[PDB]
Amino acid sequence: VNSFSGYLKLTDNVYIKNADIVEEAKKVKPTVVVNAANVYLKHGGGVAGALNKATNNAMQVESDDYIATNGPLKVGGSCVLSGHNLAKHCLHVVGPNVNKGEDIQLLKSAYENFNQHEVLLAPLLSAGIFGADPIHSLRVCVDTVRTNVYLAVFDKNLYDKLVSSFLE
Ligand SMILES: Nc1nc2ccccc2c(=O)[nH]1
C-alpha cells in the first residue's frame, strides 16, 4: 500500500525519515524494501540482520536458495526476492565495502538498481560496516536514483547531520 508518513522532502524523488526500517516496513506495507546485502546474502548484522530477524529467518532460507542457483552476487549488483511479511519484494543490493578496498565508484552502480522500482523503502548503502561516509552515500543516491526513494535512518544524530548537510 506504500503508506509513507512523516518523511522530509530532500528532492522531488528522495525523502528521509529518522526511523527503524523494520518498523517502517510493518506500518507502510511497501511494494519494495531494500536490503543492504553482502555478496553471499548472509544477513548477519545491521539492516540485513534486522530485516531477516523480522521475517523469523524466512528471508535467510530464500536467500540461500537463490545463492544455490546464482553463486555470489557482484558488488554493485542486486536481486529481487520475496519481501515476506515486510514488503511484496525485497531488493537485495550490494554496495562496495570500502574497508576491503572495494571502489567507492561502485556505490553509483548499487543505487542504479533502485531505478528498476517505482517506489522503494531503503537504507543508505555502504554505510556502517561497509565504511562509506553516509552523507556521501546520500549524495550518490540523490544524483543516481530517479524513482521515488523513502530513506530510513535509525540513528538520530546521523539523521540530523544528513538533513543539516542537505538543507543548510
Ligand atoms: N531493529 C534494527 N534496525 C536497524 C536499522 C539500521 C541499522 C541497524 C539496525 C539494527 O541492528 N536493528
Structural features:
alpha/beta, four-stranded mixed sheet, 36% helix, 20% strand, globular, viral protein, Macrodomain, ADP-ribose, SARS-CoV-2
Give the domain tally.
1
Instruction: Give the structural class.
Output: alpha/beta
Q: Calculate the terminal CA-CA distance, rounded to whole Å.
A: 33 Å
Strand sequence of the main sheet, in spatial order?
A: 1-2-7-6
Shape: globular
Tally of helical runs: 6
Order of helices and strands: EEHEHHEEHEHEH
Bound molecules: 2-aminoquinazolin-4(3H)-one
**Roughly how much helix do the residues carry, as a percent range?**
25-40%
Largest sheet, if any?
A: 4 strands, mixed
Instruction: Give the radius of gyration.
Output: 15 Å
Q: Strand-residue fraction? A: 15-25%
User: What's the count of strands?
Assistant: 7
Protein name: Papain-like protease nsp3
Catalytic activity: Thiol-dependent hydrolysis of ester, thioester, amide, peptide and isopeptide bonds formed by the C-terminal Gly of ubiquitin (a 76-residue protein attached to proteins as an intracellular targeting signal)
Subunit structure: May form homohexamers. Interacts with N protein.
Membrane topology: Multi-pass membrane protein
